């Protein structure tokens, strides 16, 4: 009995779409005075409750809320950052102005078709499970399959995150099984904490590097 | 009362999204034809958007009302002329008109390069709603001033007409939008209205 969007839910989603259009129109008018060199977009997905909203919020604002406010379908956050390409000496190259649009999808099945419609906008994916929830780790293969059927290129860039690493007493997912899974699919893996920020920026910067590197292959 | 999204509704929508991803990936791999042109049909539920596209792609019409489950699209390979013919692969998005799908369908406005906007010549409320639909397009399109072709559909139902041609021509004139009176049942002006939209979209990208 998945229920249809209430008009309050629908108002909230239409306002996200309204914000996204303003953003894309500013980018259409030679957007790529605070301006930038590229609008980079990616998308966070994974089961409900794993920490997708908290991870993006920790990354953009350095803050964390204990209270669970499940996401009404779709949202996004933004961050201006400076990206520097890598070479035989680390982050060697010139600093590029990157405007990040960080899509945040609801994890509950009831929003599956709404959220999948935004894969077309994503250049990369941040895939999360919860180190304290074995079911959310087991669903990772399904999520990856969904990404390969629904992304809008063929081998989409993904970074896997096992989140809530600060809850060490409640950990149930074994490190070797997760590392093996990421190894099997060739995707980078980070254990993260939205609560204290551990590996948040590293995981997102790796995804950003992957997308920039792919883009320079053209 | 409380009503629900069925798993069959969501499965059908996911299959459209799967088909759309497969198509864009095929266009990525040197996608044959010369351009993938996308446009989108919208308007109140029941005005005939699904019927109009089906008449255009297949030359057929179904009397029975099967409301669209959120989104679908059809495809057509056509030849466009500004010899002078270019091979165009058309993606024809078909949105559900009912409010319950407003957010799903609005997410696809950005994928469109032009819009086929419909009302029902026999439903005055659907003509009055045209202004609002134009607002949503301006607010959510790719493109501040998006190409729109307006269609007053069901012209074959002349004895149930309630929208006067002059009122409709006047509305379209206030916006600078081409207007066609169409029939999905017998095909009248269908191909003309879509070719007009295509021409607006082709001419616009050639201004580059
Ligand atoms: N201790 C701890 N709690 C976390 C962490 N990440 C999220 N949480 C908590 O777990 C709950 C769910 O997090 P939330 O970010 O909303 O998850 P979500 O992936 O967005 N869920 P949904 O898909 O329903 O929107 C919240 O109470 C949040 O505070 C983390 O790294 N550590
Ligand atoms: N006589 C006549 N009937 C038409 C015409 N166009 C559509 N219809 C009929 O009107 C009904 C609604 O058509 P349909 O294409 O399903 O409309 P829709 O705009 O796609 N509805 P929705 O937004 O709910 O998916 C159907 O019974 C269809 O046969 C037309 O030009 N003439
Ligand atoms: C998954 C397709 C891809 O490789 N890149 C991509 N994804 C996009 C989503 C929306 C708009 C544009 C998109 N691109 C093209 C830009 C790009 C190309 C290579 C690497 C990164 N980004
Ligand atoms: C402003 C004209 C317009 O709508 N362009 C548009 N719409 C797109 C939707 C999806 C992908 C790319 C799109 N573009 C840019 C290409 C284009 C197409 C037709 C006319 C002008 N530009
Ligand atoms: Mg969330
Ligand atoms: Mg329909």
Residue numbers in the entry:
A (entry chain A): -37 to -6, 3 to 188
B (entry chain B): -37 to -7, 5 to 55, 63 to 188
From the primary publication:
Rab27A and Rab27B are secretory Rabs with well-characterised roles in transport and docking of secretory vesicles (exosomes) at the plasma membrane. Rab27A promotes the growth and invasion of multiple cancer types such as breast, lung and pancreatic, by enhancing secretion of chemokines, metalloproteases and exosomes. Reported co-crystal structures show that several effectors of Rab27A interact with the Rab27A SF4 pocket (‘WF-binding pocket’) via a conserved tryptophan–phenylalanine (WF) dipeptide motif. To obtain structural insight into the ligandability of this pocket, a novel construct was designed fusing Rab27A to part of an effector protein (fRab27A), allowing crystallisation of Rab27A in high throughput.
Covalent ligands are increasingly used to target challenging proteins. fRab27A contains two cysteine residues (C123 and C188) in close proximity to the WF-binding pocket, which are mutated to serine in crystal structures. Sequence alignment of Rab27A and Rab27B against the Rab family demonstrated that these two cysteine residues are unique to Rab27 among other family members, suggesting that cysteine-reactive covalent fragments targeting the WF binding site may offer a means to ligand Rab27 selectively over other Rabs. Compounds A01 and B01 were confirmed as hits against fRab27A-C188 and fRab27A-C123, respectively. Hit fragment A01 preferentially reacted with fRab27A-C188, whereas fragment B01 was found to react with both fRab27A-C123 and fRab27A-C188 with significant rate enhancement over GSH. Residues K11 and D91 were located in close proximity to the methyl ether moiety, suggesting a route to build further polar contacts in analogues of A01. The structure of B01 bound to fRab27A-C123 demonstrated similar hydrophobic interactions with M93 and M185. However, in contrast to the fRab27A-C188-A01 structures, in which the SF4 pocket is largely unperturbed by C188 modification, and the Rab27A-Slp2a complex, C123 modification by B01 caused the side chain of Y122 to adopt an alternate conformation, opening up an enlarged cavity in the pocket. Interestingly, molecular dynamic simulations on Rab27A (PDB: 3 BC1, chain A) suggested that the Y122 sidechain has three main rotamers with the rotamer trapped by the fRab27A-C123-B01 complex as the preferred conformation. The B01 fragment was also positioned with potential fragment growth vectors to form polar interactions with K11 and D91.
